[PDB]
Design a protein around this nucleic acid. Structure first.
Lengths: 65, 53, 160, 114, 154
RNA sequence: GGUGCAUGGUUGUCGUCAGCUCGUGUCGUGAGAUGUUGGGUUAAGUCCCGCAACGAGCGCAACCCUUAUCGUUAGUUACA
RNA sequence: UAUUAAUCUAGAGUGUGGUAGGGAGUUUUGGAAUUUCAUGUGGAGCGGUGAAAUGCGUAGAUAUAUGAAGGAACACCAGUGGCGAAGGCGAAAACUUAGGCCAUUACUGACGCUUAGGCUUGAAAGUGUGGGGAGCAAAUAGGAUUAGAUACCCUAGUAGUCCACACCGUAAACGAUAGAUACUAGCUGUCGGGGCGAUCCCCUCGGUAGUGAAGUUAACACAUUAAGUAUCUCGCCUGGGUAGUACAUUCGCAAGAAUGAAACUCAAACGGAAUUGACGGGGACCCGCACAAGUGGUGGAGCAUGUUGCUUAAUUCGAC
């Protein structure tokens, strides 16, 4: 279930589609792999970078809910 | 990793969380290499692509 | 097809070799027919366990020879419902010199059958029509009334 | 003691420790797998951890406690069964947190046991 | 690998009307005879109402009910430090083990004529004084002692 | 008298284990495979479905000896 | 075959529009977590394997919870992966940014490719200098199974591991697959581009992979990225130990490395793959007084039996 090729924005950054980035983020502050997300993986790797930034930005915890 | 559902149901939901943490953090007591880390990442990818698909 | 034109046919397992190897299979089908004839002649001359074993062996031979037991001679021509489904049949036909007619599918290969026909088995509209018309060819060849091959749209035998 | 408090459970491949403590940090009691006649191989089993956890829950119930906080720190296989032992030993549970020394992929660990 | 086989239980002793009676007679078997252990059991009962008086039928059924064990221990080893794992057994082997215990603790003793010693042995095994009840208590207490190794069952 | 480092004849052994195979044929450039393996069943390849397969033999069992119900040939020296 | 001139690009590459990636290096920040430090508590353990042991510990150890210093790398994200000259890259960010991708009609206009020479890099170890040893750990110290054992394991601990100038310029440098050019299905599956639509299920061309047609190979197996198709070029293998030992060239302060022999011997090489078995501290399947149980018997004891080491006038031989 892609959320960036589906939305057609095609623009990935820190804060403009955060809920779309979190759609691939489990409540456990962990991102689902490619075999679970099943998307174009441009947007999924962008999610990877953005949510690792969020962990660095303390949006979501490292090891917590 | 917090789990607060009921007196006992919270632990029932926490069982899977504890299993996940135990399987994730078990690799800090033996020898490992970064190339072997990528190797085992590819191996588990193949495992979940063949079994879990 | 058989009830419209009398002809030897194979419906059970086409054995992995019944045309390139048919000598010890000719003797096998002869043993089967002879044992059935003896059982018709026999009426409980032995213990019933031996009769149970006799029926056991008869059915064992039937479950492999049930298809190939009506012809006593090698065929001069054979049809195929699917080239990949009848690997034994096409193999034994290529060992001989008899041409092959098959209903090729897009997942099959067209370099295996002497008469490639794009007839689907997943879609029954082709296979039913082709079976009926193959029957009708030899029917009109034998000077008997013909059912199909002159209709714009024959019987709709769509499989569920 | 105080009705509140925290029960902490730590596990290493050949050790388990369980301590009932005040919320400020000071402990009220603690036990380990070696406290009984199961030291060694028998102390790597969930039985030793369960009995130690029951012992500390019982001795802190005598010392005075109720529904407790749950702090697990470690990577042991019995880190889930210990919480069940807390729940069934009178020191019931409502929530559980993680104080584990789980390292984000870091430096060299000890040598490989095999 | 053989599996469940048709074990057979013979007709009960038709002078006391109990299958456990004939099983006991055929477990304490000396020289092969049942006319031997039958006399042994009858004289044992006679001396039972002679010393330590008790009705033979009630005391026998009570002993049969009580001296039966609870579980069994299978030996398990992988590399070292072998241990036991609990397992369940049908009651036939339980009463068989009771038979064997009675035979072993009766056929061998000083303290003269066997009549009174076997009567004393069966009476002690009946009134819960330790001759076979201790094994039943231990096998229950054994599971909670080596439970750390008992849990390791596959 | 010996060399079972010639052996025969005879066996034991795995093991009464459920295995050993073979002819028809085909594939693999080749050793090799296939039929037997797997899955069902009395210990049991007693037996069956299946397949590059078809059948057939050896082991095995049903078949043989003893135990064995009734009847049948016939009755003493068993019986009495 | 090669040269001559220019327009055509169509490979060399280039432009416009877009473009994925942990590329690399340098720089910036952060603490989840451990140790020191601070608050404490507490009783008798902690540390850990195959059982345990070395070791820490009543002076307070382990544990218990966070916080400053410290430095390591940054759970999932992590792709039948991307990128990357193989080599290697995973917290996040910035600078240079290499190259990957199409829409590439357009563009100098054969410019091109390999390439011994040469240049560079090639992991990591280790090591010269400046740091921490918080954590790990070679060497080291101890316990432990091997007949010892340095080897499995566990605990600690110096250099070092981690950073920068870096060096050794060596590999299991693996796709065990040298590059560049032109072409070759389908399918399986990860990815990029343009195009047009909700995203997968859309097309095209490519990067990294596989089954597999034709094709190739000794078979295994390559197969659109070939080991194919043909070309071009370079280096190597024309047997193994001999053999990285002889001489000898070169790099290095350091630890050590690149090219490179023989006499002598074997018909072979720890030659390769496939190919039928049993074993496996690899198992699946199928069964047996094969195992438990009691009955016993022997090993414990007496004779009865025959033998064996010994002893005889022979203690007949074999069955081991």
């Amino acid at each position: 279930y892609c959320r960036f090729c589906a939305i057609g924005q095609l623009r990935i950054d820190l804060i403009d589609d955060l809920e779309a980035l979190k759609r691939f983020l489990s409540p456990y502050a962990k991102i689902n792999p490619r075999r679970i997300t099943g998307n174009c993986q441009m947007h999924q790797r962008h999610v990877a970078k953005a949510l690792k930034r969020a962990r660095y930005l303390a949006l979501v915890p490292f090891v917590k809910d | 990793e917090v789990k607060n559902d009921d007196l006992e149901l919270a632990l029932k939901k926490f069982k899977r969380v504890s299993l996940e943490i135990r399987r994730l953090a078990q690799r800090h007591e033996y020898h490992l290499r970064k190339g072997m880390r990528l190797r085992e990442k590819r191996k588990i990818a193949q495992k979940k692509r063949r079994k879990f698909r | 097809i058989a009830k419209r034109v009398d002809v030897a046919f194979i419906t059970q397992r086409w054995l992995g070799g019944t045309l390139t190897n048919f000598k010890t299979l000719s003797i096998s089908i002869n043993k089967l027919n002879k044992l059935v004839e003896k059982q018709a002649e026999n009426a409980a001359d032995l213990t019933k366990k031996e009769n149970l074993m006799l029926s056991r062996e008869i059915e064992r031979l039937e479950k492999f020879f049930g298809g190939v037991k009506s012809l006593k001679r090698l065929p001069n021509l054979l049809i195929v419902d699917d080239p990949v489904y009848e690997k034994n049949a096409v193999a034994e036909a290529n060992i001989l010199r008899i041409p092959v007619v098959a209903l090729c599918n897009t997942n099959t290969n067209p370099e295996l059958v002497d008469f490639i026909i794009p007839a689907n088995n997943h879609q029954p509209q082709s296979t039913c029509l082709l079976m009926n018309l193959l029957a009708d060819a030899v029917a009109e060849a034998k000077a008997m009334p013909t059912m199909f091959a002159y209709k714009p749209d024959e019987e709709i035998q769509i499989e569920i | 003691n105080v009705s509140s408090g925290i029960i902490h459970v730590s596990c290493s491949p050949n050790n388990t420790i369980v301590s009932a403590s005040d919320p400020g940090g000071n402990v009220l009691c603690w036990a380990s797998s070696g406290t009984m006649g199961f030291k060694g191989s028998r102390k790597k089993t969930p039985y030793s951890a369960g009995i130690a956890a029951d012992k500390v829950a019982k001795t802190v119930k005598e010392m005075g406690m109720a529904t407790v906080k749950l702090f697990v720190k470690g990577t042991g296989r019995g880190k889930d069964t210990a919480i069940r032992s807390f729940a069934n030993a009178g020191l019931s549970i409502t929530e559980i947190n993680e104080k584990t020394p789980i390292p984000h992929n870091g430096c060299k660990p000890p040598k490989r046991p095999r | 690998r053989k599996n469940r086989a048709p074990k057979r239980t013979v007709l009960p002793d038709p002078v006391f009307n109990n299958t456990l009676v004939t099983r006991i007679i055929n477990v304490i078997m000396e020289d092969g005879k049942k006319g031997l252990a039958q006399r042994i059991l009858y004289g044992a009962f006679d001396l039972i109402e002679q010393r330590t008086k008790e009705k033979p039928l009630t005391v026998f059924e009570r002993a049969v009910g009580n001296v039966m064990p609870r579980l069994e221990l299978r030996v398990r080893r992988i590399a070292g430090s072998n241990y036991q794992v609990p397992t369940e057994v049908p009651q036939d082997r339980k009463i068989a083990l009771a038979l064997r215990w009675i035979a072993m603790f009766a056929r061998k003793r000083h303290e003269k004529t066997m009549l009174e010693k076997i009567a004393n042995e069966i009476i002690d095994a009946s009134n819960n004084t330790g001759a076979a009840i201790k094994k039943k208590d231990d096998t229950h207490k054994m599971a909670e002692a080596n439970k750390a190794f008992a849990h390791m069952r596959w």
